Design an enzyme around this catalytic site. Structure first.
Site, PDB file in Angstrom:
ATOM      1  N   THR A  12      44.430  37.926  34.211  1.00 21.09           N
ATOM      2  CA  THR A  12      44.065  36.489  34.151  1.00 21.09           C
ATOM      3  C   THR A  12      45.230  35.598  34.543  1.00 21.09           C
ATOM      4  O   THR A  12      46.366  35.831  34.133  1.00 21.09           O
ATOM      5  CB  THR A  12      43.594  36.094  32.723  1.00 21.09           C
ATOM      6  OG1 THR A  12      42.182  36.290  32.617  1.00 21.09           O
ATOM      7  CG2 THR A  12      43.912  34.638  32.414  1.00 21.09           C
ATOM      8  N   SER A  13      44.939  34.576  35.340  1.00 21.49           N
ATOM      9  CA  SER A  13      45.953  33.614  35.756  1.00 21.49           C
ATOM     10  C   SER A  13      45.391  32.224  35.487  1.00 21.49           C
ATOM     11  O   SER A  13      44.374  31.830  36.059  1.00 21.49           O
ATOM     12  CB  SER A  13      46.278  33.782  37.236  1.00 21.49           C
ATOM     13  OG  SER A  13      46.844  35.056  37.492  1.00 21.49           O
TER      14      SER A  13
END
Lengths: 198, 204, 250, 233, 244, 244, 222, 196, 243
Positions: free
Chosen positions: H1-2
């Site tokens: 996840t970013s």
């Protein structure tokens, strides 16, 4: 473990229980009576965890005596064993279970028949001609599977037990210091004081 | 360790032509030590039969529990509980102990008194219902039972025939399991009558 | 704070009467009439939608409620007390039965549960009895069709037909005249309408009368298809239109 | 009237009165007299101990709450024990948790609130005792008057109990004088004994009858009884 | 019948709660206290009857602070007042703990409101014997409030309660009329000292002590503070001067 | 406070009597009469349905005779709803016993437990007692056929023949007049009907106004059988005994 | 197990295989994995079977009671919210992994719930041991604006990928179509591509084959 | 996840990838990680999906009840409620949350609540497994008071890099612009940002 | 015996006096309110009376915003009104959290009515002396008006009025609908529906209103809001240019 044996003959149930109480490296007592009378015609023998053993026996005894007084009646052997089974079955799922195995020998005055109930700490109950708790069963079940007979007299039962105790005193690793034998029949519970050489 | 392998035992149910059969072995041991050759695992409440494998103490406890519930049910409903309803009662009673389950493998067999339709069902220890039309198996020799049933079974067997099939399924499965056997009892159920037979089998 | 009313509010008087229950019954007496008639293939329960203002939308107020797909209830007395009783009844049918047996409760048992709830408001601490009498109609496989009355005391009794509330004495007398053990559902609906007319002062039409029945299964009211054993609810509220059609044949 | 509104502390009378609280206040008036006064360096408590018989003792009326705080009671003794015990704990908490001696002003607020709770709830009863609190904290000598109504007030001096009115007028007169008895305890005490005797009538303060307590700049709250008060009679 | 006034939560035949009404009597029998909303804050003043020379002057403070931006003063049973403030403090602490920002005056008013209204819901408790004037500055201005024993409260331009509430209210109304633009914190402090003096005539028998506090965005930075020393005397004089 | 509205359902009168129990008993005395008669080969339970109508469904009705066990049943005199609360707990107690000892519960143990529950409402809790009196008919292998009776006080006793509800005085005198130790179920059935027949406050004694039950040990079997008579069955036994 | 959910132009469809297993043994060759939450909200579950079933009936029961209380049709987001908050509370101990689909007054919906309590929304979903085989199909044929017929086909093909390629799945395909304006239609055993061939022999035993030691009649009546 | 949130001239923007994995398997390739807890108060979630969703749902509940009683809540207040939940329940939670909101008085604000439950107000914040790879890039390219177009570019480039190196990140890039003008949802597909 | 008038137990006539006296309290504020349904909106009008000059007029209201979509006007003492408003808000927020969608106007009404029924049956809780009118544009039902009283009763209305002169307003509205034959103000804009509302409030009460004598709350798809003195003044002006 300790030796707890029971055999139901024609008109009685005989219970034999080892006399030794050992802790670690020492046999602390050699005259221990691993039994409690629950009612004039019902006897219970027990083996297991050090303190739980007697605490359980006495707790059951207290309850049966209470029922007897309240009802001025004596519960049948089957009734008492069912009560004991339920207590153990509750215990096995409690915080600290009672680690005790018992044999309940009783003479049912209404049916006029002796009865032997074997119940482990899990609340596993079964009615048998003969039973045992611990390692004992490993030498006595087949011995009795061979020598036992339905119609045996109390005297024949005692000779049958003697055969059991001799086998145990021969092959068992521990010195259980002999056994105390008690007979339960239509006249109550009496202790055979002479088994040290019967 | 494994609560399901301490005492041993098996139960199997089969449907036939306007009939159902439920059988079980009689063994009750403690690991390698056989202790009782008279421990039956089939019970009944009215016309509904229940077989239970697994930990013996729970087998006994559950039977006393269902006798208790079916008794109250009859007093309130004023009729005997039916197979389908009882199956739901077993399921919810098991799931109610989801995180402290009874270590058993229940099996229900019976004939709906109103529809005359034969019924059988199995459950895992927490209530999941398995409703097969042919057979249901449970116990320490369940793999063997599945093998025998899948092979020996065929639809609409007559009572007398279903008896031979159920008995051969139980007997041969038990003989390949160290913890099952030591005697067996078979129940042949019909709308009107119920016959109970003790089978002759290997005693080792 | 904390409810410190832990004693009963209904107690026995020297004569043996339970005042609060008696008074609750008097409240039921002032209530709008409601009745129930059992036919051979169904049951009908009905009452008057005594709108408290022409500005009120009488449809947003149902005096006849579904408890289970095969059981319905109607009442006489305090409307609010009934509303909460219906909520509790619908729930007890689940908690004390469906979640256990996987099937809805037979009429007599659910009635028994409701009756219990009402009996407790007669003995528990800090409460007053419910000021209502209910008529519960239903069907279940092993008992067929049935009609029950539950009073403020918690007592209940099975009926072939009956009426409660305002003009119950007259209505009951009228029912005893027209009832027989061979009535078909439509016949009971008809007798129900006639009986209710004697109790209504003003307008008498599908918009002022609330009536429901317990009859055949309504697969069209099930909401899905694909399961043979599921044929739909037996409880159905008649529409305003369905009522008027039967009033022309009054 | 009254009889219909004095059944419990949770009822207001038609005029906004709380009779149970007022009746509790009456227990104080029936109590033996006690006096309190302070200068800028000390605070003193003088109390008249009452006895049942001439064979009984003269019930103590001064309780030490901490090395720097103490009080005198008038009314129900047990209620004083309860309140002073709560005060002992609050003083204790302050020291153990904050290593700080409890301010007399705070002690007063705490007592007020503890009493207030027994005047708005059903089942309880107001406390039936009055208290005079004296103490030396980070802001000097202090004297507080506690009434069961929950009202606590800070004064230079005061008195409560039977005939307390005498001693009180005396102090309200002697004010400018004793308020300056700084650095001299014996004088402050004498000034107290003189104020208290202004409420006598029955007898005269004897040795086992007079009770005095003092606290100040360099004087931990200490109680003097008997022979210890002889030099003041 | 009768007896509708013996139990707290009972409705009389005319829909009233007599116990709350009797609580009010206890309030009207109390010292007079006021509050004045200025252009960027609020001022609180109260009459402190000098029972005797024995009362250490300036020591028995009546105005109480809640959090750091709210002032509370009340007339009636003082202990009941403290009780209500303690609740307000727990209430404000709770709000700050969850929302980080100190509690808005309106929000705070309702917290006291609900709590007070709660004490008119059961016969196991007695209503509060005080009317409370409180307020302060927040994210969007100054707010003044007055809460009655019934739990009723509204925002005010000026407010008074206690023995001389009528004199005070009369004075407050004049101010409201003669200053549609708004009074200033500095002015309000003096004006407050005057009204307390005027309203002291309904008790002119006993001598008293004046107490003022204020919370102004400019004069105190939005923090509640007591008026002391020079600013206090300057207000005392302004009153003593217009009392003649 | 609340104390004001507390009736104090569990106090002694100056004479040492329990008000509520006495009043509950008064209530019971207006209930349909229920009779119990014990014979050598069985027990009979009969009760008069108080109030009936043409429209009352008698086939689905039961207001006086309830099955507690397969060996125990009760006849009710009092509040039906109250009775149902007690009957249900009695049913549970019987099953707990069975599960514990694997034996049906002895008749007296069950009666005593129920009587004890009633006794409680008499000594603590502040709740009204149950307005119910029961006649227990049961069988166990220790005392055989047994007949007991319990009322609001929690007291219970055994009988050969007994009645509860309305006109028990008249009913008792009639029973004490024709009862005989060596009676037989059928004799008892008839005695019960005759007694009700002479005590009824109604015109005649029809079947639609009765409930009948017998507990016999069917000679052709060896077990105990309970039989709650059906409408038709009552109509029959009604004509046979000569009441038509 | 292989279960999938597929949205189409005017509704949503869910499907699942019919194999139930205990370890490597097939216990039920034709169980039904498609459960009903309400008339038009159906659910399919994977993981601890007793759990998916129980959680489905519990929320189903409460959804019914909520519907009766509000006089409104049950909403899929309500079943979703109640399921997730329940599962979350049990920190994953209730091993229920579900795909909930349905139509309500606000439209058609497709969601997935995991044992720990997290939910997802999508146009096509798959769960279970056959999850990957089914998704390979869905990722290869799904397209926006499918017709009811295309959806049934796509979903059906997805379960098949699982039946054939996943050992944890097999037997038949069950489908349930939920179209915005109509009743939900449950298609039990919509496909049956795994019929057991006729056995080579009959094992019907000659009567008397089994040795009996004792016999007796059992009493059912009371 | 970013995930990241960046304050700028007109307010603030939240961005995130759309990949959710369970091991190396992509359970969802079009996840929506931009979560709304109030009209103009959104958050980006990282850590346990079950946990962050339960947190978000509770926060939303609190802000809704807050609004009903005291009007619109400040972004600081929203960050406070998140914090309270994350700190007080730190032993049973694995949640990394970035709170971003637009206030008329305070304009755009960004608060990051990492694993421990501590709160940090910042000009911009990045989080998620993919964020480690862009600490250098973001630090070198971030400027205060950028324009909407510049901010959308900064975020698009930053995240495309995060997606590029982190296997746990991927799919599309979602953005939410929060300003006085309202709320705007943006989405960028692979074929676009992959070639930046 | 005579206490059957202090707590909520039945009187020999099966009446609950405490509930009746609670109803009496609802008029203590001598204010009247009414609600009407537009084509796609719902308007509630209530007189606003501020006698004391020391009061901050902006803090005197009996209209409350329960949720983004539900509005509630109360007839009764302010403390009980605020007690009811806080509860309704908490209840509306909880519903959305547990069930995933906005609590419907009628459901919130039933819920508050149920809570009220309880004070009517349990002795330790007193009824609240208020009548609550809930409004919104329900996503399923459209414009909605549901009112609950101290008896625990509640129902939906086409339009309704509450207060001392409730009857006059009611018959006025009744007559209008007997005429229009439809169950709502057939207007497209809420401004005109608000004008209809105020217009009939004047006709029925025979009184003129300034911008500070009224208080207006409006409900539309996805939002409920109250009007400002100025929004109202604009309304008053419009109606003036018709008479």
């Amino acid at each position: 473990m300790d030796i707890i044996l029971g055999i139901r003959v024609q008109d009685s149930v005989i219970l034999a229980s080892s006399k030794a109480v050992t802790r670690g490296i020492s046999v602390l007592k050699d005259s221990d009576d691993k039994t409690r009378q629950l009612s004039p015609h019902t006897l219970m023998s027990f083996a297991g965890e050090a303190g739980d053993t007697v605490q359980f026996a006495e707790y059951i005894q207290a309850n049966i005596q209470l029922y007897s007084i309240r009802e001025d009646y004596e519960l049948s052997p089957q009734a008492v064993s069912s009560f004991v089974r339920q207590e153990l079955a509750k215990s096995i799922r409690s915080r600290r279970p009672y680690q005790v195995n018992v044999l309940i020998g009783g003479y049912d005055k209404k049916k006029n028949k002796p009865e032997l109930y074997q119940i482990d700490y899990l609340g596993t109950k079964v009615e048998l001609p003969y039973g045992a708790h611990g390692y004992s069963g490993f030498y006595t079940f087949s011995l009795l599977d061979h020598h036992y007979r339905p119609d045996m007299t109390t005297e024949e039962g005692l000779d049958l037990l003697k055969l059991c105790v001799q086998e145990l005193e021969k092959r068992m690793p521990m010195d259980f210091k002999g056994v105390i034998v008690k007979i339960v029949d239509k006249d109550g519970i009496r202790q055979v004081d002479d088994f040290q050489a019967q | 360790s494994d609560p399901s392998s301490i005492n041993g035992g098996i139960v199997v149910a089969m449907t036939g032509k306007d009939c159902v059969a439920i059988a079980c072995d009689l063994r009750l041991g403690s690991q390698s030590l056989g202790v009782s050759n008279k421990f039956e695992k089939i019970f009944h409440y009215g016309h509904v039969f229940l077989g239970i494998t697994g930990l013996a103490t729970d087998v006994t406890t559950l039977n006393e529990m269902f006798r208790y519930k079916t008794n109250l049910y009859k007093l309130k409903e004023e009729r005997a509980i039916e197979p389908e309803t009882f199956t739901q009662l077993v399921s919810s009673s098991l799931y109610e102990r989801r995180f402290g389950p009874y270590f058993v493998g229940p099996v229900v067999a019976g004939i709906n008194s109103k529809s005359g339709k034969p019924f059988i069902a199995g459950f895992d220890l927490i209530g999941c219902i398995d409703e097969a039309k042919d057979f249901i198996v449970s116990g320490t020799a369940s793999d063997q039972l599945f093998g025998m049933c899948e092979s020996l079974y065929e639809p609409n067997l007559e009572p007398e025939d279903l008896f031979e099939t159920i008995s051969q399924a139980l007997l041969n499965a038990a003989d390949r399991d160290a913890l099952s056997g030591w005697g067996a009892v078979v129940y042949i159920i019909k709308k009107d009558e119920v016959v109970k037979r003790y089978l002759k089998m290997r005693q080792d | 704070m904390t409810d410190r009313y832990s004693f009963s509010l209904t107690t026995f008087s020297p004569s043996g009467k339970l005042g609060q229950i008696d008074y609750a019954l008097t409240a039921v007496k002032q209530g709008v009439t409601s009745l129930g008639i059992k036919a051979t293939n169904g049951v009908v329960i009905a009452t008057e939608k005594k709108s408290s203002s022409p500005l009120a939308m009488s449809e947003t107020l149902s005096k006849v409620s579904l408890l289970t797909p095969d059981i319905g209830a109607v009442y006489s007395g305090m409307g609010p007390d009934y509303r909460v009783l219906v909520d509790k009844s619908r729930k007890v049918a689940h908690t004390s039965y469906k979640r256990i047996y996987g099937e809805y409760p037979p009429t007599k048992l659910l009635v028994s549960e409701v009756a219990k709830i009402m009996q407790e408001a007669t003995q528990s601490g800090g409460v007053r009895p419910f000021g209502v009498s209910l008529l519960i109609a239903g069907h279940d496989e092993f008992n067929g069709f049935s009609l029950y009355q539950v009073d403020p005391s918690g007592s209940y009794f099975p009926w072939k037909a009956t009426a409660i509330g305002k003009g119950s004495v007259a209505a009951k007398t009228f029912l005893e005249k027209r009832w027989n053990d061979e009535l078909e559902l439509e016949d009971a609906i008809h007798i129900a309408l006639l009986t209710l007319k004697e109790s209504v002062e003003g307008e008498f039409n599908g918009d002022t009368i609330e009536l429901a029945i317990i009859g055949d299964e309504n697969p069209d009211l099930l909401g899905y298809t694909g399961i043979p054993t599921d044929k739909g609810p037996r409880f159905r509220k008649l529409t305003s239109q369905e009522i008027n059609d039967r009033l022309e044949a009054l | 009237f009254r009889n219909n509104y004095d059944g419990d502390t949770v009822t207001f009378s038609p005029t906004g009165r709380l009779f149970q609280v007022e009746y509790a206040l009456e227990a104080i008036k029936q109590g033996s007299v006690t006096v309190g006064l302070r200068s800028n360096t000390h605070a003193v408590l003088v109390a008249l101990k009452r006895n049942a018989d001439e064979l009984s003792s003269y019930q103590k009326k001064i309780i030490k709450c901490d090395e720097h705080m103490g009080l005198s009671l008038a009314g129900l003794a047990p209620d004083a024990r309860v309140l002073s015990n709560y005060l002992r704990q609050q003083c204790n908490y302050s020291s153990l948790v904050f290593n700080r001696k409890l301010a007399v002003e705070r002690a007063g607020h705490l007592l007020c609130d503890k009493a207030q709770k027994n005047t708005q709830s059903y089942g309880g009863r107001p406390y039936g005792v009055g208290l005079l609190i004296i103490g030396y904290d980070k802001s000097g000598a202090h004297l507080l008057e506690f009434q069961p109504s929950g009202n606590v007030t800070e004064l230079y001096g005061t008195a409560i109990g039977a005939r307390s009115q005498g001693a009180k007028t005396y102090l309200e007169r002697t004010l400018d004088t004793f308020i300056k008895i700084d650095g001299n305890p014996d004088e402050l005490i004498k000034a107290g004994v003189e104020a208290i005797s202004q409420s006598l009538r029955d007898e005269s303060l004897t040795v086992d009858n007079l009770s005095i307590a003092i606290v100040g700049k360099d004087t931990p709250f200490t109680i003097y009884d008997g022979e210890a008060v002889a030099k003041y009679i | 019948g009768t007896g509708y006034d013996l139990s707290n939560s009972v409705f009389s035949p005319d829909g009233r709660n007599f116990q709350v009404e009797y609580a009010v009597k206890a309030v009207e029998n109390g010292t007079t206290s006021i509050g004045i909303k200025c252009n960027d804050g609020v001022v609180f003043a109260v009459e402190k009857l000098i029972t005797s020379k024995l009362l250490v002057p300036q020591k028995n403070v009546k105005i109480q602070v809640v959090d750091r931006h709210i002032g509370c003063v009340y007339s009636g049973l003082i202990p009941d007042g403290r009780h209500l403030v303690n609740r307000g403090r727990e209430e404000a602490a709770s709000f700050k703990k969850l929302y980080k920002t100190p509690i808005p005056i309106p929000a705070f008013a309702d917290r006291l409101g609900q709590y007070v209204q709660a004490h008119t819901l059961y016969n196991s408790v007695r209503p509060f014997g005080v009317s409370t004037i409180f307020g302060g500055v927040d994210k969007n201005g100054a707010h003044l409030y007055m809460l009655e024993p019934s739990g009723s409260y509204w925002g005010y331009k000026g407010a008074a309660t206690g023995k001389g509430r009528q004199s005070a209210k009369a004075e407050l109304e004049k101010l409201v009329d003669h200053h549609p633009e708004g009074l200033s914190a500095r002015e309000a402090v003096k004006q407050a000292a005057k009204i307390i003096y005027l309203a002291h005539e309904d008790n002119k028998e006993k001598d008293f002590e004046l107490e003022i506090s204020w919370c102004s965005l400019s004069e105190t930075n939005g923090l509640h503070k007591f008026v002391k020393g020079d600013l206090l005397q300057e207000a005392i004089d302004f009153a003593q001067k217009e009392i003649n | 406070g609340s104390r004001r509205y507390d009736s104090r359902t569990t106090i002694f009168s100056p004479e040492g009597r329990l008000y509520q129990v006495e009043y509950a008993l008064e209530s019971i005395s207006h209930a349909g009469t229920a009779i119990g008669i014990m014979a050598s080969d069985g027990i009979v339970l009969a009760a008069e349905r108080k109030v009936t109508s043409t429209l009352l469904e008698q086939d689905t009705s039961t207001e006086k005779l309830y099955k507690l066990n397969d060996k125990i049943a009760v006849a009710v005199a009092g509040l039906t709803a109250d009775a149902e609360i007690l009957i249900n707990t009695a049913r549970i107690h019987a099953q707990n016993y069975l599960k514990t000892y694997n034996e049906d519960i002895p008749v007296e143990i069950l009666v005593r437990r129920l009587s004890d529950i009633k006794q409680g409402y008499t000594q603590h809790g502040g709740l009204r007692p149950f307005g119910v009196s029961f006649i227990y008919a049961g069988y166990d292998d220790r005392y055989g056929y047994q007949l007991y009776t319990s009322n609001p006080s929690g007291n219970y006793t055994g009988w050969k023949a007994i009645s509860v509800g309305a006109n028990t005085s008249a009913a008792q005198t009639l029973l004490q007049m024709d009862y005989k130790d060596d009676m037989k179920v059928d004799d008892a059935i008839e005695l019960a009907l005759k007694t009700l027949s002479k005590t009824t406050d109604s015109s005649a004694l029809t079947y639609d106004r009765l409930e009948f039950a017998t507990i016999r040990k069917g000679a052709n079997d060896g077990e105990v059988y309970q039989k709650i008579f059906k409408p038709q069955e009552i109509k029959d036994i009604l004509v046979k005994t000569g009441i038509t | 197990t292989t279960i999938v959910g597929v949205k189409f132009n005017n509704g949503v469809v869910i499907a699942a295989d019919t194999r139930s297993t205990q370890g490597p043994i097939v216990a039920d060759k034709n169980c039904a994995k498609l459960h009903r939450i309400s008339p038009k909200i159906w659910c399919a579950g994977a993981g601890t079977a007793a759990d998916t079933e129980a959680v489905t009936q519990l929320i189903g029961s409460n959804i019914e009671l909520h519907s009766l209380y509000t006089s409104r049709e049950p909403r899929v987001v309500s079943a979703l919210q109640m399921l997730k908050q329940h599962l979350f509370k049990y920190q994953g101990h209730i091993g229920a992994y579900l795909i909930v689909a349905g139509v309500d007054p606000t439209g058609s919906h497709l969601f997935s719930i995991h044992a720990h309590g997290s939910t997802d929304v999508g146009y096509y979903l798959s769960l279970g041991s056959g999850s990957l085989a089914a998704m390979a199909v869905l990722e290869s044929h799904w397209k926006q604006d499918l017709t009811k017929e295309e959806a049934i086909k796509l979903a059906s093909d997805a379960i098949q990928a699982g039946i054939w390629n996943d050992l944890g799945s097999g037997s038949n395909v069950d489908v349930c179509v939920m179209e915005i304006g109509k009743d939900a239609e449950y298609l039990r055993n919509y496909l049956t591509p795994n019929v057991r061939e006729e056995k080579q022999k009959s094992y019907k035993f000659p009567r008397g084959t089994t040795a009996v030691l004792k016999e007796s009649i059992v009493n059912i009546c009371d | 996840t970013s995930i990241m949130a960046v304050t700028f001239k007109d307010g603030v923007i939240l961005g995130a990838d759309s990949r959710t994995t369970t091991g190396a398997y992509i359970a969802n390739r079009v996840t929506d990680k931009l979560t709304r807890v109030h009209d103009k108060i959104w958050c980006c979630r990282s850590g346990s999906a079950a946990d962050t969703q339960a947190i978000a749902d509770i926060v939303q509940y609190h802000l809704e009840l807050y609004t009903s009683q005291y009007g619109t809540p400040s972004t600081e207040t929203a960050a406070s409620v998140f914090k309270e939940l994350c700190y007080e329940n730190k032993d049973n939670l694995t949640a990394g949350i970035i709170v971003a909101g637009y206030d008329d008085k305070n304009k755009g604000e960004v608060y990051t609540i990492p694993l421990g439950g501590s709160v940090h107000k910042l000009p911009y914040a990045i989080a998620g497994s993919g964020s480690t790879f862009i600490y250098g890039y973001c630090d070198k390219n971030f400027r205060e008071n950028m324009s909407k177009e510049e901010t959308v570019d900064f975020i698009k480039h930053s995240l495309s890099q995060a997606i590029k190196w982190d296997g746990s990140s991927g799919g599309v890039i979602r953005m939410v612009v929060l300003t006085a003008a309202g709320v705007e949802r943006l989405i960028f597909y692979p074929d676009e940002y992959e070639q930046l | 015996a005579g206490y059957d008038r202090h707590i909520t137990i039945f009187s020999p006539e099966g009446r609950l006096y405490q509930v009746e006296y609670a109803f009496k309290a609802t008029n203590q504020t001598n204010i009247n309110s009414l609600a009407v349904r537009g084509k796609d909106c719902t308007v509630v009008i209530s007189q606003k009376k501020v006698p004391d000059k020391l009061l901050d007029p902006t803090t005197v209201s009996y209209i409350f915003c329960i949720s983004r979509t539900i509005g509630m006007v109360v007839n009764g003492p302010i403390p009980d009104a605020r007690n009811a408003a806080l509860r309704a808000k908490a209840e509306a927020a909880e519903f959305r959290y547990k069930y995933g969608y906005d609590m419907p106007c009628d459901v919130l009404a039933k819920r508050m009515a149920n809570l009220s029924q309880i004070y009517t049956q349990r002795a330790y809780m007193r009824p609240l002396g208020v009548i609550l009118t809930f409004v919104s544009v329900d996503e399923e039902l459209g414009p909605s008006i549901y009112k609950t009283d101290p008896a625990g009763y509640y129902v939906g209305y086409k339009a309704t009025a509450t207060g001392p002169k409730q009857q006059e307003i009611t018959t006025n509205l009744e007559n209008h609908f007997k005429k229009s034959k439809i169950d709502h103000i057939n207007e497209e804009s809420w401004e005109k529906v608000v004008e209809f509302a105020i217009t009939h409030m004047i006709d029925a009460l025979g009184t003129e209103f300034s911008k500070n004598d009224l208080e207006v709350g409006v409900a539309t798809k996805d939002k409920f809001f109250t009007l400002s003195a100025e929004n109202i003044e604009e309304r008053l002006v419009a109606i003036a240019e018709q008479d």
